[PDB]
């Protein structure tokens, strides 16, 4: 099974705006480039987020990490047994993502996934944020999470759980209209309450948002003000019912894709009981 979400690549129409957004607003460290992708760091990893030019204005690929070469071959076996097409990343691709091995595939609705092992770390170039943020919570929980939009949540669930080994944490019925709600399914693969959530939202993007977790509540408060100065806030500060992430949301430069910047969630384990919630917000998060 997948151990954690390790990296995200975006293909965007406004590379300079994304560069400013990730550095001066979010606080990530610029980390050079690989090919036509600008790289950004949140920790000891050589890169966590890549930004390349493209008309998609969307998530172009997600890197799903396993712990060693044998684990990667076991995932190849799981894909074969499930009839899921995949290819082995070539040397050029391994070099581009700075990994020792990877399998390239897509989820049932077209999102490219890369299952990899052996990522590059650069402790001799210690992390230096570009904006005042004390650090991010990553480690064994990976980079954060994202909410994946899908046309068929049951079909997506079968793939992410049965093939990739994610596990359902809980469900939130998200009220859309007067008598319309969407059941968002939240999936974990480590202690992070969720790494991927699945929802049948009427949005023309592959994801609704990605989330980064900062070390302190002040990190979140300060970030809110930077994103507000940029005119990007989409939600007031609030706290979620299920993971209890205390966060705000803001627009990325790609329309309809948001970032969530948060602190202090609950973590999970093998004893996490599936439960259902009727609201996303325990408090706050008023939409603006």
- The nearest distance, CB 221 to a copy of itself, in angstroms, is 4
* From Fe ion, a copy of itself, none, interface partner of 221 (C-beta below 5 to 8 A by class): a copy of itself
Flag whether 145 is marked binding. yes
- The nearest distance, CB 279 to a copy of itself, in angstroms, is 5
Please, are residues 153 and 235 in contact by the beta-carbon 8 Å criterion? no
**Among candidate residues 264, 282, 277, 272, the one with its CA nearest the CA of residue 214:** 264
Q: Quick check: 277 binds a copy of itself (CB under 8 A)?
A: yes
Q: Which of residues 152-171 bind a copy of itself (CB under 8 A)?
A: 168, 171
Which of the 8 DSSP states describes residue 77?
H
Q: Which of residues 203-222 bind a copy of itself (CB under 8 A)?
A: 217-218, 221-222
Determine which residue in the list 76, 79, 127, 155 makes contact with a copy of itself, applying CB under 8 A.
Answer: 127
Which of the 8 DSSP states describes residue 84?
-
Sign of CA dihedral 211, 214, 220, 226: negative
Please, are residues 251 and 261 in contact by the beta-carbon 8 Å criterion? no
Q: Quick check: 267 binds a copy of itself (CB under 8 A)?
A: no
Determine which residue in the list 119, 144, 262, 265 makes contact with a copy of itself, applying CB under 8 A.
Answer: 119
Determine which residue in the list 23, 43, 228, 232 makes contact with a copy of itself, applying CB under 8 A.
Answer: 228
In the chain, residues preceding a discontinuity (C to N beyond 2.5 A) are none
Which residue is nearest to Fe ion, using beta carbons? Answer: 211
Sign of CA dihedral 65, 68, 69, 71: negative
Provide the binding-site residues for Fe ion, judged by CB under 5 A.
211, 260
Flag whether 260 is marked binding. yes
| Cβ density class 189-211: b for 16+ within 10 Å, e for less | bbbbbbbbbbbbbeeebbbbbbb
Determine which residue in the list 89, 144, 238, 265 makes contact with a copy of itself, applying CB under 8 A.
Answer: 238
Residue closer to Fe ion, measured from CB, 60 or 211: 211
* From a copy of itself, Fe ion, none, interface partner of 278 (C-beta below 5 to 8 A by class): a copy of itself
Report CA-CA distances (Å) from 190 to 161, 181, 195, 238.
Answer: 13, 28, 8, 24
Find tokens 């949540």 and name the residue.
153
Instruction: Cite the annotated binding site for Fe cation by residue number.
Output: 145, 209, 260
């Amino acid at each position: 099974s997948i151990e954690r979400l390790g990296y995200l690549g975006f293909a965007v129409k406004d590379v300079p705006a994304w560069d400013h957004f990730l550095t001066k607003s979010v606080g990530l460290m610029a980390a050079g480039s690989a090919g036509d992708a600008a790289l950004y760091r949140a920790d000891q990893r050589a890169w966590r987020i890549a930004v390349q030019p493209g008309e998609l204005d969307d998530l172009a690929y997600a890197g799903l990490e396993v712990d060693d070469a044998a684990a990667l071959e076991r995932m190849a076996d799981k894909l074969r047994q499930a009839g899921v097409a995949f290819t082995r990343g070539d040397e050029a691709l391994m070099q581009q993502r700075k990994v020792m091995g990877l399998l390239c595939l897509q989820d049932p609705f077209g999102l490219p996934l890369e299952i990899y092992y052996g990522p590059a770390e650069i402790f001799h170039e210690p992390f230096l944020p570009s904006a005042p943020v004390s650090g991010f919570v990553t480690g064994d929980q990976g980079i954060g999470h994202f909410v994946r939009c899908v046309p068929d949540t049951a079909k997506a669930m079968a793939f992410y759980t049965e093939v990739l080994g994610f596990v359902l944490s809980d469900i939130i019925d998200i009220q859309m209209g007067p008598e319309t709600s969407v059941p968002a399914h939240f999936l974990h693969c480590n202690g992070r309450h969720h790494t991927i959530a699945l929802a049948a939202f009427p949005i023309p993007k592959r994801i609704h948002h990605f989330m980064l977790q900062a070390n302190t509540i002040d990190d979140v408060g300060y970030a809110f003000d930077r994103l507000d100065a940029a005119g990007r806030i989409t939600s007031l500060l609030g706290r979620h019912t299920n993971d209890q992430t205390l966060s705000f949301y803001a627009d990325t430069p790609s329309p309809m894709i948001e970032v969530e910047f948060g602190w202090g969630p609950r973590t999970v384990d093998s004893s996490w009981t599936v439960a259902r919630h009727s609201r996303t917000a325990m408090w706050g998060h008023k939409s603006v």
